[PDB]
Design a protein around this ligand. Structure first.
Ligand SMILES: [Ca+2]
Ligand SMILES: [Ca+2]
Ligand SMILES: [Ca+2]
Ligand SMILES: [Ca+2]
Ligand SMILES: [Ca+2]
Ligand SMILES: [Ca+2]
Ligand SMILES: [Ca+2]
Ligand SMILES: [Ca+2]
Ligand SMILES: [Ca+2]
Ligand SMILES: [Ca+2]
Lengths: 182, 122, 182, 122
């Protein structure tokens, strides 16, 4: 009569990847020395949000406009440190200098692992009503009573202005490139 | 059990493994709880042979002491009741995935398709 | 009827490595001589946290900006000693000079073994209420009543400033590279 | 017993050895405690043959002197009771790992898969 092939059984699911692994928002500052002066100053920070089930990040940070900056600076070095402060006392404070880039070595590889990524768990003992803020600046709160894996990169500059050069508004541009994610 | 669209899934995943376990939970205390991992398939080995025997098939007998007013539900999810006070031989296959998304690939709604083929019955 | 292959039995576990073997946080100081003077001064320390089931560490410490430092110094030598102080009297005090780097030999290999890594066990006789602090500076406590394998690297500088050279804020940069871990 | 995904585990481990011991603990004092290391598998020798005989299989007889109200549990973990006042022949295989993680490799959730194949039964 009818000979079934015994194949007409199926089960189906779906998959998606709708977001990039990281988001970067910048809060950098300015370098305002006199002509030919030597100094150092904190630039600011850059928030690196971490997305769904991302645990380790490998980045490459580059001084994109290093060639443009050369005729205005005798030397210019940017030091990037990963760190944050919190009231959690179960997560703790962190500080980790990761790279030093300059006009001669504009690129550097940075790795962010479990300690570089700060996470709060509001439904646990240690994370009752705890915040996360930029190191040394308690008024700039990043995360408050919610689970948002975040990394904070703090920028500090060491510079030598060129003798007699007067300039007004040239930008300092940093580019981030994701290399590996897990 | 075969991953029918494994070739389609390859350019979106660095690796993808599906683990299938037979198991259930019940209040019978005469049939008991069961758990049995049966196969692990992937994009390189899409097919696997699975055998379901007496313990993999859960049956209730409402007119007996041990099966008075007993249910059968998915392991770990008591609100999803499969069988209630009736004789219906049933097996539950639970799926778990281990995956590595490909770097930089953005995708929306591609399906994951599993095909079942009966080989022998008794 | 049915011929079983007798293969459908499985048991599964998981593995992860989510942290790098070491963490380095810096507390270095400054070198402030007169123009052309000869002297020596303690720079500071650098805390090296040890992670899960890590017992021996082989590092490479480099003076990253040695070329930049050359026109300001006739010579500059950095001596790194591993050591700590404690009240444990079951762990004891430690001191171990590990490397001497300079502008001509900027890199050196350092090995940290069981004695270089200080660990407390608060639930034992010898480690009741004991602390760990930087040698010679009792007010800088590193570990208190908890198990955190830590190594302390202390920096001391021997320098000769160049005659007549006036400089303000150039940085001294040390880079650490992990070679082997067990 | 085979390490099914040994090839997948290779780029994350310099070496990885799994030691399997058959053993159990009990209050029977007529069956006694048992411990028997049976195999050591690794990424280079993923498979090993294991034989379970009369001592590896623990059985209780609740209607006898020595097995009055006796339990069987995992060695060193008294809170995980396997069998209680009933006749259920059971063998317990305990797993211990010796591993060397690869230098600088960061990984999150890859699985370790063991496959069991029956060869002979009596
Ligand atoms: Ca100048
Ligand atoms: Ca100045
Ligand atoms: Ca992840
Ligand atoms: Ca990846
Ligand atoms: Ca048949
Ligand atoms: Ca001199
Ligand atoms: Ca002097
Ligand atoms: Ca170790
Ligand atoms: Ca190693
Ligand atoms: Ca036989």
């Amino acid at each position: 009569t009818t000979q079934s092939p015994l194949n007409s059984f199926y089960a189906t699911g779906t998959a998606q990847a709708v977001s990039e692994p990281i988001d970067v928002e910048s809060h950098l500052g300015s370098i305002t020395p006199a002509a030919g002066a030597q100094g150092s100053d904190d630039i600011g920070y850059a928030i690196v949000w971490i997305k769904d089930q991302v645990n380790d990040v490998k980045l490459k940070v580059t001084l994109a406009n290093a060639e443009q900056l050369k005729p205005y600076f005798k030397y210019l070095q940017i030091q990037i440190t990963s760190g944050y402060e919190t009231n959690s006392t179960a997560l703790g404070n962190f500080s980790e200098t990761k790279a030093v880039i300059s006009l001669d070595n504009p690129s550097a590889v940075i790795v962010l692992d479990k300690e570089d990524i700060a996470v709060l768990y509001p439904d646990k003992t240690g994370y009752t009503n705890t915040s996360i803020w930029v190191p040394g600046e308690p008024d700039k709160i990043i995360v408050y009573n919610e689970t948002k894996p975040v990394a904070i990169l703090n920028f500090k500059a060491f510079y030598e202005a060129k003798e007699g050069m007067l300039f007004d508004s040239l930008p300092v541009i940093f580019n981030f490139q994701v290399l590996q994610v897990g």
